[PDB]
Amino acid sequence: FEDILSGNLLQRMLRPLRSGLTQLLDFF
Q: Half-sphere exposure of 17 toward its Cβ, with a 13 Å CA cutoff?
């Protein structure tokens, strides 16, 4: 795996995941 065991993939995701939920809840 791409070093994900240390939580690295979560540290990438803190940007794009925060920027999806808010874009839906803007009109949902």
A: 6
The span from the CA of 26 to the CA of 20, in Å, is 10
Give residue 12's identity as a one-letter amino acid code: R
Secondary structure of residue 18 in the 3-state scheme? helix
Q: Are 2 and 8 in contact (CB under 8 A)?
A: yes
Q: How far apart are CA 7 and CA 25, in angstroms?
A: 27
In 1-28, which ranges are continuous DSSP H helix?
Answer: 8-13, 18-25
Method: NMR
